[PDB]
Amino acid sequence: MFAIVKTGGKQYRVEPGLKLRVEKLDAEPGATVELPVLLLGGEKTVVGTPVVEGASVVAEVLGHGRGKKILVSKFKAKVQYRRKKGHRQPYTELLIKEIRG
């Protein structure tokens, strides 16, 4: 099956079981379930119909073994006598586990 959900002002297409980062969510615990909106069924032998925001109730079932991740970066602005290496952004990641469509 196919599918396209939106999260964090961004929209991804998911399948029947997988995921990566998505951006911090109040899903406080790791072992928890949340369902994000959907945008295009998936065309498979189950459907293949989109529509206006596709707010047809149906959504994706997502669990998630996460923990606010981070990452290197180093943002060094620099003009001239002006240096500001004063920046480390790791950005909080939120790993999810897509379940069913």
Binding site: F2, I4, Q11, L40, V52, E53, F75, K76, A77, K85
Partner: protein, 117 residues
Amino acid sequence: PRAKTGVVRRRKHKKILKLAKGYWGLRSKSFRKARETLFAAGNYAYAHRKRRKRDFRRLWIVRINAACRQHGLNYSTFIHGLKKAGIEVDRKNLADLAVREPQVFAELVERAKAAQG
């Protein structure tokens, strides 16, 4: 109490050096030729992360367009055909459908021209 320079500096430099490893010449052998570089490298990355974003914006349009052009229509027309139809979707990016599962796209195209009947 005389506070010698002692170690401090050496370290302060090794750091910047590591950062500039693999660079061209003294560019990666000079406690300062390195520095100067790491500077350009500074904005370069920063300025680019800003570019990359709008880099793919375009990088996609091409696909979309050079994809739905096969069904006799302008990316221009196409899009409009959606806005006035309804579709906070596709995400110039997610118009990856035009490639993977092109039938998914097809319906969209026909869906598109529809709004302009």
